[PDB]
Amino acid sequence: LAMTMEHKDRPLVRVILTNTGSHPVKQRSVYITALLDTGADDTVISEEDWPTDWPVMEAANPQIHGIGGGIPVRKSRDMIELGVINRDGSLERPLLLFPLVAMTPVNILGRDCLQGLGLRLTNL
Amino acid sequence: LAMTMEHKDRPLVRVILTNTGSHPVKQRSVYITALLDTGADDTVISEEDWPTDWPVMEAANPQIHGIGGGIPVRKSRDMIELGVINRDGSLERPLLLFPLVAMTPVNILGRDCLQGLGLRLTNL
Numbered sequence: 001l002a003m004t005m006e007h008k009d010r011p012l013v014r015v016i017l018t019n020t021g022s023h024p025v026k027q028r029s030v031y032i033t034a035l036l037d038t039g040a041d042d043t044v045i046s047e048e049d050w051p052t053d054w055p056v057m058e059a060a061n062p063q064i065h066g067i068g069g070g071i072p073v074r075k076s077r078d079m080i081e082l083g084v085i086n087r088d089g090s091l092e093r094p095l096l097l098f099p100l101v102a103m104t105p106v107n108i109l110g111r112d113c114l115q116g117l118g119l120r121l122t123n124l
Numbered sequence: 125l126a127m128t129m130e131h132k133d134r135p136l137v138r139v140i141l142t143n144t145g146s147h148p149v150k151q152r153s154v155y156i157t158a159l160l161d162t163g164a165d166d167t168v169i170s171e172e173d174w175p176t177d178w179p180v181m182e183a184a185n186p187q188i189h190g191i192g193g194g195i196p197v198r199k200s201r202d203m204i205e206l207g208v209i210n211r212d213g214s215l216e217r218p219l220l221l222f223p224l225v226a227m228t229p230v231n232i233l234g235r236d237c238l239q240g241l242g243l244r245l246t247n248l
């Protein structure tokens with residue numbers, strides 16, 4: 001990946017998720033749009049994009065906090081496989097994880113994912 | 125500036141702010157800490173580190189929405205000069221703005237002054 005910081009355009013990307021849980025779900029693979037968030041410790045998919053059938057459990061800390069304050073957070077129970085699509089077509093490396101889900105206004109890939117993809121923010 | 129993204133520790137820089145306004149201030153220059161934030165569109169200095177004796181305007185829209193809800197903002201009257209000292213004291217390029225001011229848990233270097241530093245995310 002390579003993506004110049006532009007104040008006007010948010011570092012937005014195409015992401016395909018895939019529930020790999022040995023257990024049925026209506027749709028194993030979905031499609032979303034997700035901001036690349038460096039001030040985001042964690043990767044959290046909004047509840048309005050999380051499938052009503054993909055199970056969830058307790059996240060270790062009842063909520064996540066940000067600007068306005070804390071927002072309730074639950075965690076993925078199955079391992080989702082997260083795959084990133086670069087603007088031009090190409091595919092970034094597949095990473096697996098148990099995401100956090102909450103009423104986020106946007107799905108954000110936090111520093112845990114950013115790190116897996118091998119991302120350094122640079123002006124060099 | 126070339127920060128490799130870890131989930132581990134945050135993209136934090138130590139900054140310098142100078143009130144370039146033609147009016148007395150107690151202290152013109154202050155050192156603060158800040159996080160590099162691609163998910164944030166504006167730079168927002170904490171009410172905590174803002175020497176509240178640098179006037180503000182309630183200007184724009186009391187933005188500051190994030191996963192929390194909304195929070196009031198002010199924006200600096202006087203153009204502020206902002207400098208990114210990296211680990212060595214070597215400063216980056218001086219930027220000039222009118223940061224937004226709110227009760228942010230941390231000072232954010234948003235994309236605007238993030239594209240002014242030339243920062244871009246990459247793994248190539």
Ligand SMILES: CCCC[C@H](NC(=O)[C@H](C)NC(=O)[C@H](CCC(=O)O)NC(=O)[C@H](Cc1ccccc1)NC[C@H](CC(C)C)NC(=O)[C@@H](NC(=O)[C@@H](N)CCCNC(N)=[NH2+])C(C)C)C(N)=O
Pocket residue numbers: 035037039040041042043044061063064065066067105106108110159161163164165166168187188189190191229230232234
């Ligand atoms: C015991 C510790 C366990 C770990 C757990 N960690 C957290 O809660 C941590 C601190 N939270 C975070 O990392 C959260 C994201 C949630 C998450 O990943 O968990 N990050 C954040 O909230 C960061 C900023 C931040 C940085 C440091 C500290 C606090 C906040 N902001 C993310 C957020 C995303 C955006 C799409 C709405 N951006 C904003 O809040 C910025 N807002 C904007 O740029 C607006 N102008 C436009 C967005 C609104 N509209 C919309 N979305 N359609 C603002 C900073 C200028 C905890 N502490 O409970």
